[PDB]
Amino acid sequence: MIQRTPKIQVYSRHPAENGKSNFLNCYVSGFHPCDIEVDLLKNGERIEKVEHSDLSFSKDWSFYLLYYTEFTPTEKDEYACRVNHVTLSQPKIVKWDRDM
């Protein structure tokens, strides 16, 4: 079927509290074809030790996938998600918007 471009959402598991351990998630949804690269970024730099869900799909072959890592937020630190996919020219970055 026809190509389609991922929806990308970045969120913490519990609400932020500086210096308290949390998890950071990057949820990539709705996309096709399946092949995709995902990386999480502490101040523009690629976190080593990340974990991920399996890659699941609908009857209509939309794919869904989750990346996450334990982390401790601080006032100075800035976190984001870098996705590359065919439907993206340029690897797309999306910031973690704290204030929600």
Ligand X SMILES: Cc1ccc2c(c1)sc(-c1ccc(N(C)C)cc1)[n+]2C
Minimum CB separation from its own copies for residue 63, in Å?
8
Residues counted in the chain: 100
Selection from 67, 20, 1 nearest residue 40 by Cα:
67
Instruction: Assess 60 for contact with its own copies (CB under 8 A).
Output: no
Residue nearer to its own copies on the CB measure, 59 or 76: 59
Q: Beta strand 51-52 with 63-71: parallel, antiparallel or unpaired?
A: antiparallel
Residue nearer to its own copies on the CB measure, 12 or 28: 28
Mapped onto helix, strand or coil, the DSSP state of residue 2 is: coil
Residue recorded with tokens 């996938």? 65
Q: Which of 15, 33, 44, 91 binds ligand X (CB under 6 A)?
A: 15
Q: Which of 2, 45, 48, 54 binds its own copies (CB under 8 A)?
A: 54
Instruction: Assess 3 for contact with ligand X (CB under 6 A).
Output: no
